[PDB]
Design a protein around this ligand. Structure first.
Ligand code: NA
Ligand code: NA
Ligand code: NA
Length: 224
């Protein structure tokens, strides 16, 4: 919490396997929780990414959300720091495959590190994911968080809306659970949500398959 007062370096490491296609992503940048802001560049270090970059955005550090003062009692993510938390998700792409992800989010020295294993199964070879038919952009979402007292953690549920190149929308249902790594006490929040926004771009000097991401997230849903 006091660990987030300024700008914090971020490292993201993802190992993925989707319908047997193996890939790795490495991301580097910084987080400014005071303003809810993330600035990162991600590289596919194994060559071509076999799924669209937008499908990995949510997997690729909610401790950088801005929690307003009146919500300070509800910030599980920072309260678990520095020892961190496990973040697990199931992502269900409507009429296509699923991702299962397990990550650890924790400080390693001065750097906030998100280390992820992703397994994707049951994707259509000519669907929107393996067929690379999703637009290179991101919509603004609401991440609904609830406490899971018995697990000493939280759950989240939300839908990601991926614009498709034919003008339709590909929904991705997100089920999420977070548990602390360490033994120290954490905050168990009242129901609230994170309001998100982001933009995806390219670095014209970067020849590797990559994504530049700028993201802003603020907590809300508890009136002062
Ligand atoms: Na509390
Ligand atoms: Na659910
Ligand atoms: Na240039």
């Amino acid at each position: 919490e006091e660990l987030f007062t300024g700008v914090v370096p971020i490292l993201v490491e993802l190992d993925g396997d989707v319908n047997g296609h193996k890939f790795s992503v490495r991301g580097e940048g910084e987080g400014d929780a005071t303003n809810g802001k993330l600035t990162l560049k991600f590289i596919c270090t194994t060559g071509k990414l076999p799924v669209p970059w937008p499908t990995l955005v949510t997997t690729l550090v909610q401790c950088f959300s801005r929690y307003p003062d009146h919500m300070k009692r509800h910030d599980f993510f920072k309260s678990a720091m520095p020892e961190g938390y496990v973040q697990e998700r199931t992502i269900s792409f409507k009429d296509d495959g699923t991702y299962k992800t397990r990550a650890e989010v924790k400080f390693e020295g001065d750097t906030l590190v998100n280390r992820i294993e992703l397994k994707g199964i049951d994707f259509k070879e000519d669907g929107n994911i393996l067929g690379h038919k999703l637009e290179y952009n991101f919509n603004s979402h609401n991440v609904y968080i609830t406490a899971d007292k018995q697990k000493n953690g939280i759950k989240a549920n939300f839908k990601i809306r991926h614009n498709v190149e034919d003008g339709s929308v590909q929904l991705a249902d997100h089920y999420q659970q977070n548990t602390p790594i360490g033994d120290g006490p954490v905050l168990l929040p009242d129901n609230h949500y994170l309001s998100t926004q982001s933009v995806l771009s390219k670095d014209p000097n970067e020849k590797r398959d990559h994504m530049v991401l700028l993201e802003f997230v603020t907590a809300a849903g508890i009136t002062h």
